[PDB]
Design a protein around this ligand. Structure first.
Ligand SMILES: Nc1ncnc2c1ncn2[C@@H]1O[C@H](COP(=O)(O)O)[C@@H](OP(=O)(O)O)[C@H]1O
Ligand SMILES: O=[N+]([O-])c1ccc(O)cc1
Ligand SMILES: O=[N+]([O-])c1ccc(O)cc1
Length: 288
C-alpha cells in the first residue's frame, strides 16, 4: 500500500508497473495496432472510448461489452490481484487498441519498428497537475501525495509517476515529425469535439455518416461517461481505487486549475514553465 516509486532508466514508475516491463519485453506489435499514448490525466479514457466507438461502427451496445480497461489493454499495467495488461492482451482480438503512458526511453521498440499509428493527447500542465494530485489520492498504488503544495513541487521537477510532463509532451511532439502520430489537445476536444473526432476518423481511415458522429459526440461527453460503469472505473476493487476519496471522472473541464493554484504558486510555475518550454514550438491553452 502506497509503495515508493521505482526508477527505471531515469523514469520514476509505480512499483508494479516497473515489474511489468520484464514480461513486456516479449510483446510483439502488429502492423494494424493503434497506440493511444498520453502523459497521465490528459484525456486517455476519453479518446479510448471515442476510438472503441469508431471501431464498433458507433454501436453503443458493442462498447458496453466490457469496461474500457479490458477493451483497450494498458500495456505496462500490473497490480496485485488484478490481471496485467499483458495478460488481458492475450485475449484481445485484432485490430487492437493499446494504451500506454510510457516515455519513449521505455517504449517497446516493436511499436516503432512496425510503424504503428499513434494517437497522442496532450493537456495543459496546470490542469494535468491538479487532476493528477486528486488521482494520486484515489488510486492507491501511488505513493502518498502529501499536500498540494509539496505535490506541485514534485510535479515541476518530474518526481511523480511517469516522470516529467515537460519531457513527455515534447518528445512525442518531436516524434510526430517522423512517425505516424495524430497529436491532439484535450482543450481542442473540449472546445469542439465533433471537429476533433472528424480528425481521428480521417487519421484511422474510417468513414462514418454525420448522424453517427453526432451520436458519438453525445455519448462521449463528460456527463455520459461519468455515468457509464464501463468507462468511469467504478467497477474496480475499492482497495485499488476509492472513488469516495475522489471520482475518476472528476470535473472534466479546462481551466479548473484556477481554483486550486494560489497566486504565489502560479507565478513560480509560470517562470519555471517559461524556461522548460523555451525552445519548443508547442502551444497550450490554459482556459477555454
Ligand atoms: N468525456 C470526457 N470529457 C472531458 N473530460 C473527460 C472525459 N472523460 C474523462 N475526462 C477527464 O480526463 C481526466 C482523466 O484522464 P485520463 O483518462 O488520462 O486519466 C479527468 O480530468 P479531471 O480530473 O480534470 O476531471 C477526467 O474527468
Ligand atoms: O488501469 N486500471 O485501472 C485497470 C486496468 C486493468 C484492470 O483489470 C483493472 C484496472
Ligand atoms: O495507478 N493506476 O491505477 C493507474 C495509473 C494510470 C492510469 O492511466 C490508470 C490507472
Amino acid at each position: 500500500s502506497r509503495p515508493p516509486l521505482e526508477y527505471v532508466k531515469g523514469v520514476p514508475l509505480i512499483k508494479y508497473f516497473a515489474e511489468a516491463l520484464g514480461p513486456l519485453q516479449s510483446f510483439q506489435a502488429r502492423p494494424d495496432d493503434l497506440l493511444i499514448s498520453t502523459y497521465p490525466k490528459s484525456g486517455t479514457t476519453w479518446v479510448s472510448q471515442i476510438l472503441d466507438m469508431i471501431y464498433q461502427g458507433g454501436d453503443l451496445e458493442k462498447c458496453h461489452r466490457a469496461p474500457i480497461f479490458m477493451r483497450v489493454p494498458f500495456l505496462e499495467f500490473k497490480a496485485p490481484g488484478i490481471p496485467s495488461g499483458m495478460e488481458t492482451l492475450k485475449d484481445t482480438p485484432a485490430p487492437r487498441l493499446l494504451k500506454t503512458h510510457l516515455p519513449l526511453a521505455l517504449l517497446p521498440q516493436t511499436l516503432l519498428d512496425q510503424k504503428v499509428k499513434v494517437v497522442y493527447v496532450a493537456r495543459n500542465a496546470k490542469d494535468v497537475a491538479v487532476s493528477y494530485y486528486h488521482f494520486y489520492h484515489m488510486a492507491k498504488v501511488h505513493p502518498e501525495p502529501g499536500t498540494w503544495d509539496s505535490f506541485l513541487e514534485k510535479f515541476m521537477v518530474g518526481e511523480v509517476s511517469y516522470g516529467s510532463w515537460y519531457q513527455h509532451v515534447q518528445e512525442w511532439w518531436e516524434l510526430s515529425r517522423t512517425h505516424p502520430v495524430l497529436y491532439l489537445f484535450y482543450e481542442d476536444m473540449k472546445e469542439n469535439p465533433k471537429r476533433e473526432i472528424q480528425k481521428i476518423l480521417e487519421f484511422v481511415g474510417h468513414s462514418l455518416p454525420e448522424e453517427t458522429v453526432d451520436f458519438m459526440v453525445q455519448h462521449t461527453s463528460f456527463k455520459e461517461m461519468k455515468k457509464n460503469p464501463m468507462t468511469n472505473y467504478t467497477t474496480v476493487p475499492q482497495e485499488f481505487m476509492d472513488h469516495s476519496i475522489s471520482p475518476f471522472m472528476r470535473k472534466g473541464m479546462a481551466g479548473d486549475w484556477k481554483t486550486t493554484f494560489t497566486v504565489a504558486q502560479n507565478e513560480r510555475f509560470d517562470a519555471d514553465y517559461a524556461e522548460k518550454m523555451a525552445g519548443c514550438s508547442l502551444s497550450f491553452r490554459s482556459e477555454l
